[PDB]
């Protein structure tokens, strides 16, 4: 899987949100399911997420980026919002199955 690993690393580098110090889950579009998964977060991860978003906002206000030493690396990118999001889609799909029946 060396073909997929290097291409994923290059695509993470060229995606551009690591240059402004973001994780992957900060870049997601905030629908009602994503907002519900955000509402279920613990307080420390929530505060980290809003500080990273604010840092992104006033970094792209100046049209600048972070220095290369403190970019978000691929190995330290943590999928913190992913299990809460999966739980939210599980409850929503269960609710629509109960509404269908």
């Amino acid at each position: 899987s060396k073909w997929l690993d290097g291409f994923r690393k290059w695509y993470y580098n060229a995606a551009g949100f690591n240059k402004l110090g973001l994780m992957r889950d900060d870049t997601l579009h905030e629908t009602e399911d994503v907002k519900e998964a955000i509402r279920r977060l613990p307080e420390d991860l929530y505060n980290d997420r809003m500080f990273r978003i604010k840092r992104a906002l006033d970094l792209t206000m100046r049209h600048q980026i972070l220095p290369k030493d403190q970019w978000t690396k691929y190995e330290e990118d943590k999928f913190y919002l992913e299990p809460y999001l999966k739980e939210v889609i599980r409850e929503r799909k269960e609710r629509e199955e109960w509404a269908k029946k």
Partner: peptide, 11 residues
């Protein structure tokens, strides 16, 4: 909307 597409209520 901001150009980043994120929720801009923080700033």
């Amino acid at each position: 909307n901001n150009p980043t597409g994120l929720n801009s209520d923080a700033d």
